[PDB]
């Protein structure tokens, strides 16, 4: 049981490092550019909602 | 049962007072009391005899 719980924690840190790897991929892509456009239009909507 | 045994144990102590050369008979009865209490403490100490599987 103890190792089973340990394995859940170990999996959590492994998949955490996979998330970091995904971050490095995201900031590379010109999704970085296209999502800035997404932020831009969203900010327009927010600021117009004020 | 065990209470009969212990009545005879302590009865034999006050009888053994009255018999010299039988001064280590009472130590054997004391030993019998000892191990009786030891096994009784074993039996009371006892684990459940089955694997847990409703939490395990």
């Amino acid at each position: 049981v103890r190792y089973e719980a340990s394995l859940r924690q170990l999996e959590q840190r492994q998949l955490a490092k996979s998330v970091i790897s995904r971050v490095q991929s995201e900031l590379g892509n010109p999704k970085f550019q296209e999502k800035v456009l997404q932020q831009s239009i969203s900010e327009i909507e927010q600021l117009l909602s004020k | 049962a065990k209470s009969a045994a212990n009545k005879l144990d302590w009865a034999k102590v006050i009888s053994s007072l009255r018999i010299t050369g039988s001064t280590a008979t009472q130590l054997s009865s004391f030993k019998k009391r000892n191990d009786e209490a030891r096994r009784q403490l074993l039996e009371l100490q006892s684990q459940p005899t089955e694997v847990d599987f409703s939490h395990y």
Binding site: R8, E11, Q12, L15, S42, Q46, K50 | -
Partner: protein, 499 residues
Amino acid sequence: EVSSILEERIKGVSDEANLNETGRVLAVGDGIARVFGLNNIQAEELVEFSSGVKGMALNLEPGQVGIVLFGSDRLVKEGELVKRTGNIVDVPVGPGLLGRVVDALGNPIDGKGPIDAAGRSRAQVKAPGILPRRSVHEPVQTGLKAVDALVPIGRGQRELIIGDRQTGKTAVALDTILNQKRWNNGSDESKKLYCVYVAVGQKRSTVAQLVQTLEQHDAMKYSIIVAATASEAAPLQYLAPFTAASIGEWFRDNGKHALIVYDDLSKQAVAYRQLSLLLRRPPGREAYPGDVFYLHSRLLERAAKLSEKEGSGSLTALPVIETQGGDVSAYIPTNVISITDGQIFLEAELFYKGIRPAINVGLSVSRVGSAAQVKALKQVAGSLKLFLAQYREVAAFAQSDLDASTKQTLVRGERLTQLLKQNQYSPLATEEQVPLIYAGVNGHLDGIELSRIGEFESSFLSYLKSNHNELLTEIREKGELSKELLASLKSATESFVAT
């Protein structure tokens, strides 16, 4: 599995931020930050930094606002944008905090899910008015001989527990929680207490052992633990008693009787000292802050027994003071003593010399604690406190020609001292205490030589139950002795004493 929990979390981040106020940090460090902007800030608000740490604005100055960091400096960086939480420092309060270890922010450190909490309520609040107070009359039973009658405690009552460092100070309080296991496993809501154990300035390991102890004694289900370990940031520790007391007030304001044990306020003093010095405010007396009296008084006076009109609740308070060098003269101890009504000073010499717990009766007093008492244990125990402070005097000059009058008193006193002794983590029924005290007061423990007094006590209790548990059942319901009970006790005590 783990994937589903991750998915729940990613789904659990939603909606883009809508903010319209911020400040930007100037200089930061020393656990104080100086922020530029936030001109619309409320005073003593909670602000959230971009580092994710939160702090309470203390000094609103014309050009800067000085946040106090409830957290670690490493997290924060200069020139970060601090956005106002928008709420004065409040902590979740509600029923579902019951049986949960929490840190002072209210983050469950037992991590038994997110806390189920009715509300949140501001950390600082003014104590109930004069008119909202009804004088105490319902006792809390401690199951410890002397505590439960020589130094009796009420409900809503504020009475100090003071004494030597790590004399297992904590244990006295634990025993109270344990004694009230059958009260709190009771169905009478009036008899239900809900106890909060505030652990301040304590090792996280030690607290975990306490938690495990409590959960071994299955007491957790009626109790909350607030934890503010030594590692946790010094301002957070400062805010820790206040926050705990808010939780207590929610119970109190359900009109339900409760208790809160603040172990140890001495560590709150050191914490406030750190904060004050880091706020560069001049050291107060004994180098402890000048507002240290105010700190304690605002905390302490929140404990109350609400008036019948305005509920009926209580929040009993016992605050645990770690006396440095065991000398009660000292600014922090005396300041507390003046606030509290009654003290439970403990004497180390006696503690070492096997009175567990060793309740010094020279420096233990109880004032309005004796207005909540079981009448039976008032009748039997009458003036015994005086007698054993005559024993104290007698043995003062015993160490000489001893008059027969003094010698008789000494003989009684010594025998009584044996009677006082308790065995830690063994709480005693109130009913059971009544015959034992009768015996000693009526001097029947002359009849048992001092060495065998302990044997007598246990045997006497076994005798009492076997001979007539009718008496104890009567004291269980009546709670006040009658002539019949008094005679029955004279008869029963003489009978057992003989054998």
